[PDB]
């Protein structure tokens, strides 16, 4: 077993040219699709806000059309899922994870049209779901499609073009290339056995889809907080404390997000029409809330810059938090098409800020800016619910461009993952995979 | 299927004992990495202190610069040859093998040898980085506490070995993420699954970073300031530089490997023909650290200057080929010290050179040569050592130029791609392949 390694070391990093060229065409498509989906969703938010202006008089008539437009667009969404691809509900990041374990089918011919046009509806109605879910899943399925259409044989070509797909998926969802790459080699990989995921191949895909997003969304960042104040060493422990608070809350959110799935499964009971009707019900509520106090509704990317600057009051933040927890739950746990990834950043920012403020008045000698703590806490909910800290830390860093806050980010992030462990919490994306896989072994 | 459901619910469950020990590993590694870093500078200060007293007579100073650097190199090579032969060169090859369980982690020997030996070689002003020493000392420190505390198991062994070397790189460059990303790209047994707890690696990397920030706060290793952005129609220039780095990546490997062979003839394994050639190289570096210091030393001192476009086209080419020469001499001679850092410097000088060519070639892209310098900085790591993701995230952590992320990644990938299709190999796995195949031959 010594002589094998010498043969292996000299034959390391040898991905066949065919895989790499295909990785490139995977990314290119994923990006364009992630751009198409990103554009479509925006247009609908614009159309909906275009109708509110036609009915701007009569107050109850406006509140009705905000509901009915968001209801019908959610109704459209849930149906396209329930009738043509049941796997494309919820995030679908659990699904692509199982696909890499070879325990799930990657029915692209079904998911692509369902997740795209379905998500378009649910996101475009302004529900509390991210783009990730749709684009990550769509991503993997795109990469799978070209494995099938080009009939590429082997273990290496299947896992890799499935991985890069999902990678270039997240990369174009956040304009965050590294985050995509780092997501795959922390979360997505079969965590218990060795896999033939060519990391060099993942790159080329991620490179392409980023470029593809940069062609259409140039010069306009998703999040602009600008350069913040540094964090001196004697402050660090406060980030550890925030980590720990995020740590205990991390699993507590998981239990709710999982339990809420069960509690909503009774309302419809597996029935297609009791679901779709409940889907419009939650959808309309978001389109309603996207008018009465839009910080409770929507993707969430819109309050992050505002919360970080410390423009909300202590009262307002608490309201925004608890209300978003409510609306995050309802929309994701109801198995609507759309990720819980983004709304987790939003929730973490609002908590970070809140902690920052408490710290600002309690420790005037640290010369604290609450916005620092918001950034530390931004990717913390990812590190404690999803338990992909390194992904979360490099995701935040790619959108906030605040490297000077690297230590407090890592320390909060780690504090989240350690206390998320010793409270019996579980990786949310693996927990759904374990639930979906053990709900297949239990009706036989 | 039923196994996976039991696996997923039991994922990321590192026992508290490992995590506590991960924390104590880092804390030590950092402190030592700080201690080593201080010592090396102290001696560069002592050497520069003697040049002051013999500042008159011109050939007298050139001689004491030689003899100070010779003696300090001679002390280094000997400390390696007589008490730990495994502690020569980088030692990153070594720790890699230790993770595959095919090498012994003789800390009782390496720690004092690498530390006090490196102190000599580095502090004499040789073209070696801090990484080698700090990465190695790193893993060895982490191994020490596995032995002293008698921690049983596969997980405890690979983890406290990994974080050790991770917290090692972390304190070497004040680059936490670079440490963590090095371990899950290069260091990990690339061909089978390992029990390296990623969460444990963090805790160690955290501690050693803090340990370094306590002693070196408010002073960065590289300061380039915020550069201009890179417009989309420019990206292909970074692919072209990637390609150029791609073909040169292996060509440097061949020489660094081949120069080890050609220098092995000068001494032939003999201790005294080695040490006396060790002072010969060391002295030359301390002499060069006066006649044109940009060809000598760690190299971190020219990067800022090169990136600002302060050098002329001639100057750069000289500083490049001269560093090629001196980089080879110092690492290939198996002196203690890494080739990691000198490869950054080499890449900056090449990047800059490419930038300037591009500046007057395409005045309409409104180019800053310093952007290309940053793209090319970690490219030689991506092509010779073939750890692109670590290289990219290392540079980003020291230059803080995120807006240059796409050109960096493109150059970086362009290097790794063309470093493959010209038959080149991961230089740190190539030395492992050589040291392991000269044990069965």
């Amino acid at each position: 077993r010594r002589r094998q390694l010498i043969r292996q070391l000299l034959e390391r990093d040898k991905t066949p040219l065919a895989i790499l060229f295909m990785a490139a065409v995977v990314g290119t498509l994923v990006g364009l699709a992630a751009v198409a989906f990103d554009k479509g969703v925006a247009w609908l938010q614009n159309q909906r806000m275009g109708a509110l202006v036609h009915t701007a008089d009569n107050y109850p008539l406006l509140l009705t059309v905000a509901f009915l437009c968001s209801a019908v667009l959610a109704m459209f969404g849930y149906f396209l899922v329930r009738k043509y691809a049941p796997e494309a509900g919820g995030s679908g990041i659990p699904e692509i994870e199982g696909a890499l374990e070879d325990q799930r089918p990657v029915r692209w011919w079904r998911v692509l049209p369902v997740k795209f046009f379905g998500g378009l509806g649910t996101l475009g109605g302004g529900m509390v779901l991210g783009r990730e879910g749709p684009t990550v899943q769509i991503g993997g399925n795109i990469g799978r499609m070209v494995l099938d259409i080009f009939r590429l044989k082997g273990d290496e070509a299947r896992h890799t073009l499935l991985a890069t797909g999902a990678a270039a998926g997240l990369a174009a969802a956040f304009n965050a290339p590294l985050a995509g790459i780092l997501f795959i080699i922390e979360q997505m990989r079969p965590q218990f056995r060795y896999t033939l995921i060519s990391i060099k191949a993942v790159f080329i895909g991620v490179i392409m889809s980023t470029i593809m997003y940069r062609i259409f969304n140039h010069e306009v960042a998703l999040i602009d907080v600008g350069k913040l104040s540094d964090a001196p060493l004697n402050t660090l422990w406060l980030y550890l404390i925030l980590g720990i608070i995020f740590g205990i809350f991390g699993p507590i959110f998981n239990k709710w997000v999982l339990g809420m799935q069960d509690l909503l499964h009774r309302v419809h009971g597996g029935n297609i029409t009791k679901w779709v009707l409940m889907g419009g019900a939650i959808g309309g509520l978001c389109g309603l809330l996207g008018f009465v106090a839009p910080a409770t509704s929507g993707g969430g990317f819109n309050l992050i810059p505002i919360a970080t600057a410390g423009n909300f009051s202590m009262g307002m933040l608490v309201f925004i938090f608890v209300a978003r927890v409510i609306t995050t739950l309802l929309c994701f746990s109801s198995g609507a098409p759309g990720g819980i990834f983004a709304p987790m950043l939003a929730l973490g920012t609002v908590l970070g800020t809140a902690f920052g403020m408490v710290a600002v008045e309690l420790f005037p000698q640290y010369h604290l800016e609450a916005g620092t703590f918001a950034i530390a806490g931004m990717g913390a909910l990812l590190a404690a619910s999803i338990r992909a800290p390194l992904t979360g830390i490099i995701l935040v860093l790619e959108m906030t461009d605040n490297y000077q806050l690297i230590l407090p980010m890592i320390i909060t992030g780690l504090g989240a993952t350690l206390l998320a462990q010793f409270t019996g919490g579980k990786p949310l994306y693996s927990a759904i995979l374990a639930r979906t896989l053990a709900k297949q072994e239990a009706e036989q | 299927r039923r196994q996976l459901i039991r696996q997923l619910l039991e994922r990321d469950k590192t026992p508290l004992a490992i995590l506590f020990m991960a924390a104590v590993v880092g804390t030590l590694v950092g402190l030592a990495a700080v201690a080593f870093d201080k010592g090396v500078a102290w001696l560069q200060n002592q050497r520069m202190g003697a040049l002051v007293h013999t500042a008159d007579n011109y050939p007298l100073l050139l001689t004491v610069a030689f003899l100070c650097s010779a003696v300090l190199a001679m002390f280094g090579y000997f400390l390696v040859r007589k008490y730990a032969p495994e502690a020569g060169g980088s030692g990153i090859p070594e720790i890699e093998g230790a993770l595959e369980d095919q090498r012994p982690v003789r800390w009782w020997r390496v720690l004092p040898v690498k530390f006090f030996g490196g102190l000599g070689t580095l502090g004499g002003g040789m073209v070696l980085g801090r990484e080698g020493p700090t990465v190695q000392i790193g893993g060895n420190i982490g191994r020490m506490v596995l032995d002293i505390f008698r921690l049983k198991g596969d997980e405890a062994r690979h983890t406290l070995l990994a974080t050790g070397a991770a917290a090692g790189l972390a304190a070497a460059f004040n680059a936490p993420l670079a440490g963590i990303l090095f371990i899950i790209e290069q260091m990990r047994p690339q061909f089978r699954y390992t029990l390296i707890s990623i969460k444990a690696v963090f805790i160690g990397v955290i501690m050693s970073t803090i340990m370094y920030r306590i002693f070196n706060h408010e002073v960065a290793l590289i300061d380039v300031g915020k550069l201009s952005d890179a417009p989309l129609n420019t990206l292909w220039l970074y692919l072209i530089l990637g390609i150029i780095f791609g073909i040169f990546g292996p060509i440097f490997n061949k020489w660094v490997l081949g120069m080890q062979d050609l220098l092995h003839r000068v001494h032939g394994g003999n201790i005294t023909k080695w040490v006396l050639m060790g002072g010969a190289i060391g002295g030359l570096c301390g002499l060069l650290g006066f006649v044109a210091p940009a060809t000598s030393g760690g190299g971190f001192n020219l990067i800022p200057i090169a990136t600002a476009g302060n050098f002329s086209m001639g100057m750069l080419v000289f500083i490049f080929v001269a560093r090629v020469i001196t980089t080879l001499l110092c690492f290939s001679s198996g002196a203690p010290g890494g080739i990691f850092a000198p490869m950054l410097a080499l890449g900056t000088v090449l990047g800059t050179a490419f930038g300037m060519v591009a500046v007057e070639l395409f005045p309409q892209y409104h180019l800053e040569a310093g952007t290309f310098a940053i793209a090319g900085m970690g490219a030689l790591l991506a092509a010779s050592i073939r750890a692109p993701l670590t290289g990219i995230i290392l540079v980003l952590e020291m230059t803080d130029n995120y807006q240059l992320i796409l050109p960096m990644i493109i150059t970086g990938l362009g290097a790794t791609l063309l470093a493959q299709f010209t038959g080149g190999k991961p230089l740190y796995s190539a030395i492992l392949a050589r040291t392991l195949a000269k044990q069965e031959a």
Epitope: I215 | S228, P231, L232, V359, Q364, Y365, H366
Partner: antibody, heavy 120, light 107 residues
Amino acid sequence: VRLLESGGGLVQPGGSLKLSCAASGFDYSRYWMSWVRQAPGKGLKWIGEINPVSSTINYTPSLKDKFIISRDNAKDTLYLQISKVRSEDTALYYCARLYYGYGYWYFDVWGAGTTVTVSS
Amino acid sequence: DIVLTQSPAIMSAAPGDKVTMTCSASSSVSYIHWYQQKSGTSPKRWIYDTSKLTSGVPVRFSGSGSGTSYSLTINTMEAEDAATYYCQQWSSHPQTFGGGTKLEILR
């Protein structure tokens, strides 16, 4: 964001004048500044650009010091020193903040302009 | 340098008219920009990169073309459009401007 240039006016043929362009509302760094002139009732002609750090300065087919472009990052002010003034240099002089789209550069924000008449 | 010249020297049309002016290039160019200059104003970056609109330009305006012939098009013109419109490029150095299409209004 506002570019407010001045310093132009009356000068005798063959002489020299310095043109000032002050700026406020945007980081004066990051941006290459440019100079573009327009002769009465005619078209637009490029004079010269300058990078943020004053370290790459190109002009149009002029001659020696026909035009001299400088800046003062601390003052937020752009300068144009025109030498050996002949009747063609009688024009309006805009300072323009230079930016790009896909990567072919445009002129983003134009000033109001000062007038340079060359008469005795 | 690249010598551009603009289609009509002075064109006149009544609001409602679809109106197109053209930027013709001595050599080949790419991603040209359009500038607007209303009477006694300093020019305003109007259209850029061949067809992108600057933020705050009535969406009746459009851009198109490649190589030798680039254009600007006011689909259903309005009288508040009376201006001398300049075209300019920077695909090749030094950047050069057009002549202008002094648009006039018929009422």
